[PDB]
Design a protein around this ligand. Structure first.
Ligand code: A1AW4
Length: 209
């Protein structure tokens, strides 16, 4: 049972700008997704300070980067607070409509495109490198769900029958044909060191056979 939803117009417009604007600095997608994971980890850590049972779904707070050259996917896994079904539908837990508006106003006032994450919509920078994004998520208060979009104005949400996750979020980037440099260990290591070197959770880059 798959539900198909239209993006709000303002979000669809931001996605079309990300996909169609000529912009060579595509590597910042990973900084943005790691930053989002760090924010989600901070949220479950804070909730656990007064309710330790919130970590019954998993005590380890970490970020894994999993390239798969056979599937041409880069997966960013975190064990943060995760998202409910309602969060997924509501722009993956973001204030994307007002965030997009503030980002566009900032660009008019001289901000850089790379500042997207300051406006709460850094997730959508995934489409700098991905033709399709799949988000699998488990929040303590809901079941495990899969969100997916290839842009084009729509996204889908379904219950996920896949490998149970415990708690957290997995962002699966189905990379564009010409963006497979982001599956190479040395390139991923370089971008993490450049942009994400002080994140306060362990970031493990998996290697491949
Ligand atoms: O936001 C981005 N591009 C963009 C291009 C033109 N106008 C607004 C935004 C990319 C960083 C993700």
């Amino acid at each position: 049972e798959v539900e198909t939803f239209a993006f709000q117009a303002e979000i669809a417009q931001l996605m079309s700008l990300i996909i169609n604007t000529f912009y060579s600095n595509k590597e910042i997608f990973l900084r943005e997704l790691i930053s989002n994971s760090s924010d989600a980890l901070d949220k479950i850590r804070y909730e656990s300070l007064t309710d330790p049972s919130k970590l019954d779904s998993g005590k380890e707070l970490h970020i894994n980067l999993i390239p798969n050259k056979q599937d041409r996917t880069l997966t960013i896994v975190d064990t943060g607070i995760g998202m409910t079904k309602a969060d997924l539908i509501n722009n993956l837990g973001t204030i994307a409509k007002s965030g997009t508006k503030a980002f566009m106003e900032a660009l008019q006032a001289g901000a850089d495109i790379s500042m997207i994450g300051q406006f709460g919509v850094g997730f959508y920078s995934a489409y700098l490198v991905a033709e399709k994004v799949t988000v699998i998520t488990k929040h303590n208060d809901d079941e495990q769900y899969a969100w997916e979009s290839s842009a084009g104005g729509s996204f889908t949400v379904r219950t996920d029958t896949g490998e149970p996750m415990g708690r957290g979020t997995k962002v699966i980037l189905h990379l564009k044909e010409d963006q497979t440099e982001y599956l190479e260990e040395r390139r991923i290591k370089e971008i993490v060191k450049k942009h994400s070197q002080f994140i306060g959770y362990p970031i493990t880059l998996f290697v491949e056979k």
